Swiss-Prot record, chain B:
The modification Phosphothreonine is found at T14, T41. This is Histone H3.3. Transmembrane segments: none annotated. The modification N6-acetyllysine is found at K13, K49, K56. The lineage of its organism: Eukaryota, Metazoa, Chordata, Craniata, Vertebrata. It is found in: Nucleus; Chromosome. The modification N6-glutaryllysine is found at K13, K49, K56. Coiled coil: none annotated. The chain holds residues 68 to 136 of 136 of the full protein.
Swiss-Prot record, chain C:
This is Histone H2A type 1-B/E. The gene is H2AC4. The modification N6-(beta-hydroxybutyryl)lysine is found at K22, K81, K104. There is a cross-link at K1 (Glycyl lysine isopeptide (Lys-Gly) (interchain with G-Cter in ubiquitin)). The lineage of its organism: Eukaryota, Metazoa, Chordata, Craniata, Vertebrata. The modification N6-succinyllysine is found at K81. It comes from Homo sapiens (Human). Core component of nucleosome. Nucleosomes wrap and compact DNA into chromatin, limiting DNA accessibility to the cellular machineries which require DNA as a template. Histones thereby play a central role in transcription regulation, DNA repair, DNA replication and chromosomal stability. DNA accessibility is regulated via a complex set of post-translational modifications of histones, also called histone code, and nucleosome remodeling. GO terms for biological process: chromatin organization; heterochromatin formation; negative regulation of cell population proliferation; protein localization to CENP-A containing chromatin. The modification N6-glutaryllysine is found at K81, K104. Keywords: Acetylation, Chromosome, Citrullination, DNA-binding, Hydroxylation, Isopeptide bond, Methylation, Nucleosome core, Nucleus, Phosphoprotein, Ubl conjugation.
Curated annotation (Swiss-Prot), chain D:
Core component of nucleosome. Nucleosomes wrap and compact DNA into chromatin, limiting DNA accessibility to the cellular machineries which require DNA as a template. Histones thereby play a central role in transcription regulation, DNA repair, DNA replication and chromosomal stability. DNA accessibility is regulated via a complex set of post-translational modifications of histones, also called histone code, and nucleosome remodeling. Monoubiquitination at Lys-3 (H2BK34Ub) by the MSL1/MSL2 dimer is required for histone H3 'Lys-4' (H3K4me) and 'Lys-79' (H3K79me) methylation and transcription activation at specific gene loci, such as HOXA9 and MEIS1 loci. Similarly, monoubiquitination at Lys-89 (H2BK120Ub) by the RNF20/40 complex gives a specific tag for epigenetic transcriptional activation and is also prerequisite for histone H3 'Lys-4' and 'Lys-79' methylation. It also functions cooperatively with the FACT dimer to stimulate elongation by RNA polymerase II. Phosphorylation at Ser-5 (H2BS36ph) by AMPK in response to stress promotes transcription. The modification N6-crotonyllysine is found at K3. The modification Phosphothreonine is found at T84. It comes from Homo sapiens (Human). One of its GO terms (molecular function) is DNA binding. It is found in: Nucleus; Chromosome. The modification N6-(2-hydroxyisobutyryl)lysine is found at K3, K12, K15, K26, K54, K77, K85, K89. This is Histone H2B type 1-J. The gene is H2BC11. Transmembrane segments: none annotated.
From Swiss-Prot, chains E, F:
The chain holds residues 23 to 103 of 103 of the full protein. This is Histone H4. It is linked to Tessadori-Bicknell-Van Haaften neurodevelopmental syndrome 1: An autosomal dominant disorder with onset in infancy, characterized by poor overall growth, microcephaly, hypotonia, profound global developmental delay, impaired intellectual development, poor or absent speech, and characteristic dysmorphic facial features, including hypertelorism and abnormal nose. Other variable neurologic and systemic features may also occur. The gene is H4C1. It is found in: Nucleus; Chromosome. Its main location: nucleus.
Length: 91, 69, 104, 93, 81, 81, 106, 94
DNA sequence: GGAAAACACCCAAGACACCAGGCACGAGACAGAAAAAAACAACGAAAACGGCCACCACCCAAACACACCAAACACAAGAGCTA
DNA sequence: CCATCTTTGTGTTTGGTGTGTTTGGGTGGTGGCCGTTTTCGTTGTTTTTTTCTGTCTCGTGCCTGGTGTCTTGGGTGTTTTCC
């Protein structure tokens, strides 16, 4: 439990990206391939995608933590994920 | 509801006449907003293994919706 | 000679006037609109830079970092209310732990 | 090439409010994006107001009402006061 | 007009909650619903009022209300939009 | 490329949850999180690639991705605009 | 005989009216010729789909009068139409009947 | 000063798709508002997207791309196909 | 070429889920109370239209200085080790 | 966590120019102003109506305590795959 609070304090005080660059790059290229082939990519576009996806996932995890807190629990569950997504309006 | 709308509008600048269509549009928008909020609050109550909605679910729904900071 | 010096502003009134004219918003633009817009932009940027400098001073730093800008934006009710749907690159998140999660 | 930026003016207002404080290039880009976004919002809403009242001219009034429409709370009031003071200072010079 | 926030009566807000599929209603929720309704009405009324004041008019029309609502991402169909 | 979404490692999801202040994590969270990330990435990439296709370009630039997230209400500061 | 552009393109929507509104709606100095035709065709398709689903939903209700209730039913019961018209409230449209599964007694 | 409206065309397409069904004046108002809102959305997106590429013309390409950007799913594909059919039908006549 | 970090494996500890019990608090119905709603008339603030009249912004043309690029040297605080 | 010797790479300043902002005068019309009409918004009065308010009884849904187990968390050594 102690190292959980240590990780929370460390990552909430840090500013570097937590998603690894090369797997995310390969994921973006794999996703973009099925819309159009022979696609090139600027590095800054990939970095912008990474930053936006990280911000969105952090916000989703915060709302999910609130949902988990509501049900008198401390552990987040998938039902919290779809509750947050349903209330926020994603389908 | 018309008196309530006039009470809210009085606080900025008086002598403000309110057409019937504006009052009807305000009523329709308020009812739609309240129905959506109650649907979200019912989802919140169902998530917490309850069938009765509480004000804490209202506050949480507003928080996650972004209306409340 | 410059409209900025006549209006007592540092932002370029002529640049705002040119952007409004060639921005396809309306046919004609009054003389007071770019002055008003430049004053609003200067006041808003002065406010956010003041809060960023205060946050940098509190963090014992001399150069403003986007972390400091994120802290300044998120610690202000009016600014974060205005900028709710904005995500700052390399800004991180505001440090906040819930009351009930702290250990016992 | 010739890319426009708000760097010099942000530097001037920064040294006005904090003479001894610097700023990074990424923060400079962030400030440029912020100024451009706020400019776009205010100018577009002012154009929308001009379209509503069947008017072809953007004056200080529609800009002022757009400022009250967008900025929330005390912010909008102080911005309106500052803009009004700038307008009369320009008109009296 | 003096404190007519109580005009949103308890059966009416019960009906509004009932349309949303809610089975049981807590006794303390009514003040919260009145507060959030007041907040929403306050925001929309404020925006409609400054829309009317820009138009040099003394009467708020439906067009200002629909404009204000659509500007808040709450677009309303059926009132001349 | 085949089955590459699993490259988003489990400690990476752990770190992202730690940034959000989450103390305990269930084992089924990771696959759902991967699905959510895939949906979000697909939604952004569709608009970005449409913007590139209209401009007769063969490379995705940062400006298109910014414009596309802004069109989704996810405005990004720091990469132009 | 000066034939209308709607009759030339086989459309029911007015090509001239949408062309005038595009030219007068402060977008760009000049407007291409195919843009009003394309926009009118898209508007035609969308109103045809909406009116079709609304007429069908009225037909299940044994009614010959299209009301806002049938329009709300047609919009909310179609996934892509609900996605497109997500943030709009239909006046006098009501709410779709939806009761939760665990809300019901046993 | 007769305010223009889309009432006659909406009634024409309804009579085309449902010969035995009528429509209330309120539903006509909702349909008019819907058509107007879709018009403003597509026109504004096309104008912006044209402004991005430093272009002065809204053509069929800009409207098509705006339709692909806005309409979700099969609706976009069907609208694009029918719009292209309308454009080539207009181009084939004079 | 390089090195930091995911990953499999093995122990442990503690929060979630279920059961049981109790309490209290909205729900339901009858009776009494309220005032909302509809019809109807009067007064008049004010909105839409029209006609006039002028100051304000667009357009061409000439001019010069602020803001850009190139290029230079400075110095904030990041690297590791101390306390 | 802050602090100091030493590094460095990126912030800050400075010269030249070209392009963009500034001055001058002329025209045409958008918009301010006034005046008239007349639609509609408010304010006031009466009856039927139907809902709202209050009170009494009580069924069951919300909250709390106990067990245990299984689910996740922590530590370690390695290969590998990201930089």
């Amino acid at each position: 439990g102690t190292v959980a609070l240590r990780e929370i304090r460390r990552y909430q005080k840090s500013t570097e990206l937590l998603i690894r660059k090369l797997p995310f790059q390969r994921l973006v290229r794999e996703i973009a391939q099925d819309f159009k082939t022979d696609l090139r990519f600027q590095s800054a576009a990939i970095g912008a995608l990474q930053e936006a996806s990280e911000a969105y996932l952090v916000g989703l995890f915060e709302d999910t933590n609130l949902c988990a807190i509501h049900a008198k629990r401390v552990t987040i569950m998938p039902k919290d994920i779809q509750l947050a997504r349903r209330i926020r309006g994603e389908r | 509801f018309q008196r309530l709308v006039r009470e809210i509008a009085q606080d900025f600048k008086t002598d403000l006449r309110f057409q019937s269509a504006a009052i009807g549009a305000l009523q329709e928008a308020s009812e739609a907003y309240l129905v959506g909020l109650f649907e979200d609050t019912n989802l919140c109550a169902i998530h917490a293994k309850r069938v009765t909605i509480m004000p804490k679910d209202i506050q949480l729904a507003r928080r996650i919706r972004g209306e409340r900071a | 000679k410059t409209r900025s010096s006549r209006a007592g502003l540092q932002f370029p009134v002529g640049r705002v006037h040119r952007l409004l004219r060639k921005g396809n918003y309306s046919e004609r633009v009054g003389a007071g609109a770019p002055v008003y817009l430049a004053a609003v932009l200067e006041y808003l940027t002065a406010e956010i830079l003041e809060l960023a400098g205060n946050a940098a001073r509190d963090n014992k730093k001399t150069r403003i970092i986007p972390r400091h800008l994120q802290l300044a934006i998120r610690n202000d009710e009016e600014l974060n209310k205005l900028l709710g749907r904005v995500t700052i690159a390399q800004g991180g998140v505001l440090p906040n732990i819930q009351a009930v999660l702290l250990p016992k | 090439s010739r890319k426009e930026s708000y760097s010099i003016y942000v530097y001037k207002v920064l040294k006005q409010v904090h003479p001894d404080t610097g700023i990074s290039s990424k923060a400079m880009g962030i400030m440029n994006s912020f100024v451009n976004d706020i400019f776009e919002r205010i100018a577009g809403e002012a154009s929308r107001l001009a379209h509503y009242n069947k008017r072809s001219t953007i004056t200080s009034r529609e800009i002022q009402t757009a400022v009250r429409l967008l900025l929330p709370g005390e912010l909008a009031k102080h911005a309106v006061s500052e803009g009004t003071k700038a307008v009369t200072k320009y008109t009296s010079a | 007009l003096r404190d007519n926030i109580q005009g949103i009566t308890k059966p009416a807000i019960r009906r509004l909650a009932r349309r949303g599929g809610v089975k049981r209603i807590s006794g303390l929720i009514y003040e919260e619903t009145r507060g959030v309704l007041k907040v929403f009405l306050e925001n929309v009324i404020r925006d409609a009022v400054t829309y009317t004041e820009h138009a040099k008019r003394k009467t708020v029309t439906a067009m200002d209300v629909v404009y204000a609502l659509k500007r808040q991402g709450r677009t309303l169909y059926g009132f001349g939009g």
